Symmetry: D2
Subunit: 366 residues, 4 copies
């Protein structure tokens, strides 16, 4: 059995075109997922500029169409949130509980056995790769079972999809990485797909003061909606947001916030959470920078914890169900995150709306 | 001259008059506008000597001591009973709540104002927990005063002095409750409802309220509970309530459980409500001898009996008013009734019989 | 394959016997046992009402490896563990492999036991104690019971890692997270408590006060890392006089950490008497009885915890323990009082009952 | 009562001369210390090119000569280890326990309270500062009572004096700042005054691997004496110590060490501990860098705690007695540290030997 799927294919020239791909039947450890909605992340745009053909998409949710012989805890028709940890569960990092940095199956750490067998998905009869081992921007996906989280809820499929990246890295960086203490102060630099979810984490965690900083006013109105207490509108020409840092310091009685989160997608702002933070504060850079930047090392000075975490320290079988609860409870808002849905043929307009500043998140729906 | 409620070692209280001296150099004269009630004030009658009752209070600074730098006449203050010295072992560890020299609990004393300061008849009498808040005017050590620059209801600020701090802090400062977790509160009263608030502020996804009175249970839902359990008096060690708790937690148990029923015989009951490797926080404080089945402790369970929610008064108190100003801490709703000093007995009855979440004595 | 094994009865007696141990299935492993340490839990196994191949402490060589166990090979060197973690359940994904809800011989009792007719006595299948049953020439265990190690060290000293060393060292290092420069008190300096002393010594405790009724145990406590000793009286209830001696050596106040490992249920709350307000009290023994506790002793920020097997994550913890031994800081050799033939197992009990032997290892 | 005191004085120009200062009698919150031994830290050389006359010295110990009328817990003749925290015990940082980054009194993080009155020490009729509030390279130093920790022992004074900075920051970085856990792997970049005490702290904490790296074979020889298990000789052209970093990964199963500590006084090596570290490890640069540097941010990538701690999170009344207790037990080696004692006049040679690597620690004896 081979199935044909329309999908978004990125080519290795900065370009993406809707194509069709051939999805084989699941192997014993794999699962064929009918995708109902695929959310879009800033990393998905970056994927075009990677130099490989890939099935784009790393935020997805849907239903289990087929299951393999070895998979035992999930069934045809089951409702499944996709994750890109693909944890092997046995390696050194997995035994520390760091399944998000798995040494053998992570798409980031190992680039694998978190990917499904390559012949499972084919583009003009040449095997191609599922981005982050899941390639959600696709009618069907053949992934391994570690990529699936079963939830049993009537939650909207667009709301579910966004947990696969934006919501998890945002919330988990706050809760799992920084381990933000209730009653503290937090600064968020970049209230976008991730940063807005940082705010929900800070809000849900009990932060008393949540300082949203962005260059776009709509983004900031979004930050107010999702929990922010104070708003600062940064000028992009301000290098390192040092001028914003003085404004934060006025909001924290001279000394700075207790916590600060980077998620601007600007490599130059890598150190800028250090500028916003009190000595002994914790500075979390969520973006991920792979370039060579210059840092005034005075910003590091004086017991400030700095971490570049991945995927909010995600343990998908454990974290995803916790996020689902807070939604049902009402403390996660993710229906309201979904500003627009797009047909896969309109992915270009979706990319444009994420970068222009007009969407909290965009979900392609099938 | 001040109207104050004096406890008598015979076990009775009587409104009565005391004369208060001007402040010494490191002391503050605080006119009390509100004196919240706490369970231990009831047990403070059952102590063996006379005192000035009260360990929850708030007011304005009528008079300031010569070396007191950070406060001024007319400032607004919430009283705290930690009165930390800032120099002993525990204080340098950061445990200002178990101050080895000034604490009314662990050194009971410096940190209590000069004894001449409050005289009844002509015998100097002690202020309860060093502050004696059930008084019209109190003289106290400066370390027992926490200034606020916002303007909030005086009954709201007074309850911060004990119930709010112990309950919130046991969640935040002691248990260090993590978001997404399941919470069980045994006894949802003045401490218990702020445990719940502490749970909801910290982000708990499930908050199970167990209580023998439905009107608190109703209060518990007002203040953030997600599930309510009406226990029965004769459920020894609350075993049957444990079983419904585990039914609500997929088996296992809760990740956190909190005891504050004031019953000595339920001191291990948190361990029954909670999963292995969970953290059980007994808050009521038991000085009695009880029998415990040590199969409840078993398998990585973290037990603790913290005091005053690990209170560092000049840090946690400003935090609590910020979350009241944000709207996450509910304290105006917790003042079910205000009472004058003379109607104090009706206030114990309303608290002890479930009719108050918290009762405050206003001046 | 025939295995001469110690088989416990429900009555309270044992006999040496012979059993067939079948070839390994896909997820399980056949181990030729070279050394099996002993404890009072093995004596308890006679009390329990079940036929059982006894032994929960083991080290050996792999003789047979199943189709799906490609992470170790034949001839590899293997320290056995009794957590047998399933690796995917709630506690395993929290990092609590020692309290696995699906495979633990304690918390689940089962997967984590090899397939039942693997080891058969006459033709009735018999369980291996704690899913491992090490007092046997050959044992069939899941691969989870096996931790490859890659040092040429003496098998007997490898066998005491399987229990006394992991629970004692781990009660200090993982469960208490003992901070260098602190004061430690150890109540019961025996099979468990000597590796609690060893664990305080490696973590940097500045003052380690050993308390025990036997003078021989105290001397062997100094040898294993202690700095102070106090001799204790059984007539002391709650060790309250030993607690006030502890307060003299700890500036008033108490010790920053204390540890229960005496085997006495009436002593369950004693570490709390040993400890300053806001210290941490660790009850390593496990008490399945109801006792009376003076509740003032919990009062005031004292962390009280009874942990299992020292928070064991065997594939993680065991290699680290092997590394400290290689470094000289961890002492396993001097901990083995005497070696005994399986056929002289009653000797061992006998000498454990008397208190002659801190630990006994049966070597094949 | 004005005492004359021989001392070392840095002049702004990088030049040091022994001079005499008139040292005034103690005010109510002050203590006058007859310094008996004063060790040399790398920071004192740097203290030369600060553009201000200064009485040098921030490692020191002695006996109390005169006590102020408010000082109640110190008496003439007491044996005092000096510290440079001088904590006020009530500001925001002190009340979180961070006495070493005191907002009111720290010489680093705030002339300041915690310095004696300016008329107390004068050079040529003009008031002068004491470096790090204590200026220990002087026969007598006037300091605040909070500079003083009384020890009730009979330790060698040279051995007690190096606690004032070198031992405290190196051990503290491991125990207090990094909270190093036993059985771990640990890499130390620079085995000098701070780095050898890093190794001691790693050894007292129970590290299973302590890998020592330096460009000087003799200082590598010292690390083994104080606790290192493996040793890597790096070259001075190894930019960022990346090949040193390959040897480390060879020693740590290819993943990297759990912990790595940077104390080379070389700014470009600020990010080097990240290169020594496994993902989710903790990297600590104790040096302290004031210049801007260039950093490839994939070195931060993936859960890596980075922290620039000050003074090993020293609470001097709490930490200094633990150090003395661990000297009694034998596990802090610090008689061995004092490779050389010098007169005040041969400070230059003490400087020269610290910088050449011929000393572990060198102490000026008065
Ligand atoms: N560590 C991880 O696991 C992980 C996961 C997901 C995404 N990311 C990365 O996080 C970053 C953000 O992701 P996203 O989906 O939220 O992107 P996004 O484009 O949707 O949001 C970025 C926000 O940053 C704002 N911004 C840009 N420059 C700014 C400036 N100078 N000052 C203030 N705000 C500024 C933008 O206006 C926007 O609001 C990306 O780099 C992405 O690759 C990392
Ligand atoms: N640790 C501290 O520092 C500290 C501080 C303040 C108060 N306390 C103590 O906490 C305890 C409660 O404090 P409070 O002011 O809220 O008193 P309270 O009377 O308001 O609370 C008592 C609650 O216990 C509940 N209860 C009684 N029996 C129960 C049972 N079998 N099962 C379930 N619930 C039961 C009742 O519903 C009642 O609401 C007291 O013992 C008090 O002394 C301790
Ligand atoms: N929690 C776990 O996972 C785990 C694992 C293994 C063992 N254990 C238990 O830990 C306990 C330790 O037993 P063990 O292996 O060390 O056997 P053991 O006989 O060697 O240890 C008991 C020690 O306590 C001493 N002692 C007796 N009375 C004392 C007293 N009043 N005061 C001070 N010391 C006294 C004894 O003389 C002896 O030295 C056992 O109960 C064992 O079942 C628990
Ligand atoms: N943060 C604080 O509180 C604090 C405290 C004390 C010292 N310091 C600073 O720590 C740093 C070290 O202090 P120190 O007294 O140990 O200096 P030191 O000169 O005595 O020791 C530095 C060692 O690092 C070695 N080294 C130099 N370059 C190297 C390289 N490329 N690769 C490997 N090793 C190299 C040197 O050979 C020397 O052995 C100084 O910069 C000092 O200012 C900071
Ligand atoms: Zn993404
Ligand atoms: Zn893995
Ligand atoms: Zn109270
Ligand atoms: Zn104190
Ligand atoms: Zn055993
Ligand atoms: Zn498991
Ligand atoms: Zn220095
Ligand atoms: Zn301060």
């Amino acid at each position: 059995m081979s199935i044909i799927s329309k999908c978004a294919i990125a080519k290795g020239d900065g370009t993406f075109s809707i194509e069709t791909v051939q999805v084989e039947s699941p192997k014993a450890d794999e699962v064929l997922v009918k995708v109902k909605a695929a959310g879009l992340c800033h990393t998905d745009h970056d994927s075009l500029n990677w130099g490989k053909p890939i099935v784009m998409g790393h935020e997805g949710a849907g239903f289990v169409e087929q299951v393999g012989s070895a998979v035992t805890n999930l069934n045809v028709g089951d409702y499944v949130i996709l994750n890109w940890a693909t944890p092997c569960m046995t390696c050194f990092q997995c035994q520390e509980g760091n399944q998000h940095i798995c040494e053998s199956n992570s798409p980031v750490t190992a680039g694998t056995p978190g990917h499904a067998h390559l012949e499972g998905t084919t583009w003009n009869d040449t095997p191609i790769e599922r981005s982050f081992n899941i390639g959600t921007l696709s009618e069907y996906t053949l992934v391994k079972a570690s990529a699936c989280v079963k939830i049993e809820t009537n939650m909207p499929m667009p709301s579910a999809s966004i947990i696969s990246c934006g919501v998890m890295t945002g919330y988990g960086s706050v809760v799992n990485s920084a381990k933000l203490q209730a009653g503290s102060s937090a600064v968020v630099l970049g209230t976008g797909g991730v940063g807005l979810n940082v705010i929900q984490g800070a809000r849900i965690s009990g932060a008393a003061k949540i300082i949203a900083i962005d260059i776009n006013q709509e983004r900031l109105d979004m930050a107010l909606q999702f929990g922010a207490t104070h708003t600062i509108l940064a000028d992009k020409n301000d290098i390192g947001l040092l001028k914003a840092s003085e404004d934060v310091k006025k909001l924290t009685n001279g000394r700075g916030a207790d916590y600060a989160f980077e998620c601007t997608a600007i490599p130059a702002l890598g150190a800028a959470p250090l500028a916003m933070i009190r000595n002994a504060g914790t500075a979390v850079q969520v973006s991920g920078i792979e370039e060579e930047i210059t840092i005034d090392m005075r910003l590091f000075e004086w017991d400030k914890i700095y971490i570049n975490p991945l995927y909010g320290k995600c343990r998908p079988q454990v974290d995803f169900p916790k996020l689902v609860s807070l939604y049902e409870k009402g403390d996660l808002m993710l229906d309201e995150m979904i500003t627009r849905t797009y047909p896969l043929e309109n992915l270009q307009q979706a990319f444009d709306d994420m970068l222009t500043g007009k969407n909290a998140k965009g979900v392609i729906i099938f």
